[PDB]
Amino acid sequence: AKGTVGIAMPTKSSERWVADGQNMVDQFKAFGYDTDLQYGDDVVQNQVSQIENMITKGVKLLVIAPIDGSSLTNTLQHAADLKIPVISYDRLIKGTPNVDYYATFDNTKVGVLQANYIVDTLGVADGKGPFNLELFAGSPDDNNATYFFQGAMSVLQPYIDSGKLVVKSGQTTFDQIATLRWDGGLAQSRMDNLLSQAYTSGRVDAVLSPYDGISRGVISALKSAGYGNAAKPLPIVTGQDAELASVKSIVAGEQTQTVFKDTRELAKAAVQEADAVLTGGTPQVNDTETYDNGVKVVPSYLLDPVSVDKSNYKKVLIDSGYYTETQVQ
Numbered sequence: 223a224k225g226t227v228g229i230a231m232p233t234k235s236s237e238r239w240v241a242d243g244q245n246m247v248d249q250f251k252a253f254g255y256d257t258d259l260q261y262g263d264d265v266v267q268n269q270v271s272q273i274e275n276m277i278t279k280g281v282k283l284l285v286i287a288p289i290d291g292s293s294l295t296n297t298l299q300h301a302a303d304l305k306i307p308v309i310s311y312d313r314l315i316k317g318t319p320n321v322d323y324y325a326t327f328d329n330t331k332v333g334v335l336q337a338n339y340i341v342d343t344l345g346v347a348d349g350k351g352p353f354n355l356e357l358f359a360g361s362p363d364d365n366n367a368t369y370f371f372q373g374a375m376s377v378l379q380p381y382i383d384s385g386k387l388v389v390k391s392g393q394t395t396f397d398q399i400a401t402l403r404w405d406g407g408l409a410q411s412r413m414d415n416l417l418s419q420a421y422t423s424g425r426v427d428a429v430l431s432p433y434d435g436i437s438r439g440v441i442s443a444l445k446s447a448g449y450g451n452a453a454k455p456l457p458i459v460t461g462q463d464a465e466l467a468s469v470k471s472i473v474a475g476e477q478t479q480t481v482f483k484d485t486r487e488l489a490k491a492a493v494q495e496a497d498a499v500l501t502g503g504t505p506q507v508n509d510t511e512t513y514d515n516g517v518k519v520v521p522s523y524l525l526d527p528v529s530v531d532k533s534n535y536k537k538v539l540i541d542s543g544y545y546t547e548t549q550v551q
C-alpha cells in the first residue's frame with residue numbers, strides 16, 4: 223500500500239552499486255515498499271530514461287546515484303512537479319534545487335585516509351625521502367572526485383611543498399589527473415605515459431589512486447614497465463571500495479591499500495530516511511554545511527569509511543560479514 227520507490231544506480235561495472243541496490247531493495251521491502259531498481263550501464267541517457275519512466279509510473283520517491291551529476295536537472299523538475307522527493311545517493315546531484323537529502327560516506331575523509339597511508343608507509347613525517355609520487359582523481363562529472371582529491375591533498379601538500387614527495391611528471395591539478403568514467407583502462411593508459419615519458423629514469427614510489435578500478439589499471443601499467451619483481455617492487459598503491467579483485471591483489475602483496483565503505487550501512491540509511499520523508503518525519507542529518515550542489519547546500523548524512531590493508535582485511539571485510547572467505551580468493 224506504501225507504493226514503489228525508484229532506485230537509479232549508475233552501472234554494474236563498479237561492483238559496489240550492485241550491493242547498494244540489492245541491499246536497498248531488501249531494506250525497502252522490510253519497510254513495506256516495493257522498488258524499481260535500474261542500472262544505467264554508465265550511459266547517461268539510459269539513467270535519464272529510467273528515471274523518466276519511474277516518474278511516469280508514479281514512484282513515491284527517487285533514490286538516484288548519478289552517472290553525471292549535472293545531467294538530471296530537467297528530469298528532476300518533472301519529479302518535483304509530481305511531488306516526488308529525491309534522495310541523492312553517494313554522489314551529489316548538482317545544478318538543481320530539486321534534491322531533498324544526500325546520503326553518502328565522508329568523502330573528504332576517504333581522501334585523507336588514502337594520503338595518510340602513503341605518508342605513514344613512506345615515513346616522510348620522520349624526514350625520510352625523497353620519494354616520487356603520482357596522482358589520480360575520479361571522473362570530473364562525479365562531485366565526489368574533488369572531495370577525495372582535496373582530502374588527500376590536505377595531507378600531501380606539506381610534503382610536496384617541501385620536496386619529500388615529488389610529482390615527477392608535473393601532473394598535479396585535478397584537471398590533469400582526473401579519470402573519465404573512473405575507467406581502469408584510461409587510468410592504465412595514463413600510467414603508461416607517465417612511466418614511459420616522465421620516468422625515463424628512476425621509479426615511482428607511491429600512487430594516489432582514489433578507486434580500486436583505477437588502482438588495478440595503474441598496477442597493470444606498472445607491471446608492463448617492469449615493476450613487481452624483487453629487483454623493482456611495485457610502489458604503494460591506494461584504492462577505494464574493497465572490490466574483490468583488489469582484495470585479492472592486497473592479499474597477494476600487490477595493491478597496498480583500499481577503503482571499505484559498507485554498502486549495507488548506506489542502504490540502511492537511505493531507506494530509513496526515505497521512509498522518514500514519506501511519513502512526514504525528520505530526516506537524520508549530520509552535515510548541513512559541506513555539500514553545496516551549485517544551487518543549495520543539501521542536508522546530508524555522512525557514514526564512516528575504513529582504511530584496509532593486508533594487516534586488517536580479515537577483520538574489516540570478513541569478520542564484519544561483508545565478504546565470505548572464498549569470495550575474496
Ligand SMILES: OC[C@H]1O[C@@H](O)[C@H](O)[C@@H](O)[C@H]1O
Nearest residue numbers: 236238313364366404433463
Ligand atoms: O565508481 C567509482 C567510485 O565512484 C564514487 O562516486 C564512489 O563514491 C566510489 O565509492 C567509487 O565507487
